[PDB]
Symmetry: C4
Subunit: 63 residues, 4 copies
């Protein structure tokens, strides 16, 4: 096991450890994606109820 | 093929397998991004129709 | 250069190529993030204009 | 340290450097995810206030 190859293998291991670390940082930042999807689907639902309220107001005014 | 180099190569392979695994976890979490974009574009569309309804209500009231 | 080490180095290269490929797939899926941010900021703007229209309708009714 | 193994180790290092570079590009693209979550939660809040305004307009009209 040559010292230089040993040193380069340790460099490869260090690089791999940094990539793994960065992947978990990525997975953490992706934790709020299902929160956003949920909130967006809730907004859509609230807007639909609102469209109905405005349509009811349109009816009650046309009298 | 030195045992120690063999053992370190297996460590490199294990690290690579974990990164690959984490990439698929990342790709899975990114599956709901086109759902969010679609929903957001739908909200915008519903809001525009709503703005028109409120503008119509403004007209029908000013009579 | 031992055949077995040669074969394992080629395995390492194949694994690396798959990870690189998966990163570009990830970057592609992340292309619609600035579209979503933009649309969301537009919705907020449209909602504010709407809140004003409803407040104007409240005033015109209280007469 | 065989020249061919040396050359392949340098290829492994180059591949690792490209993946690391791509991870930071990924982390950068993920910077606007907490902006989107925040804006979406703000929209929801504005919509709720709006639903109340329309409900108040419904009351003031039914008189
Ligand atoms: Ca070196
Ligand atoms: Ca070891
Ligand atoms: Ca093998
Ligand atoms: Ca080569």
């Amino acid at each position: 096991y040559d010292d230089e190859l040993f040193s380069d293998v340790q460099d490869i291991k260090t690089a791999l450890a940094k990539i793994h670390e960065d992947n978990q940082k990525i997975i953490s930042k992706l934790e709020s994606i299902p929160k956003i999807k949920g909130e967006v689907e809730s907004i859509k639902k609230q807007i639909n109820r609102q469209n109905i309220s405005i349509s009811t107001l349109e009816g009650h005014l046309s009298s």
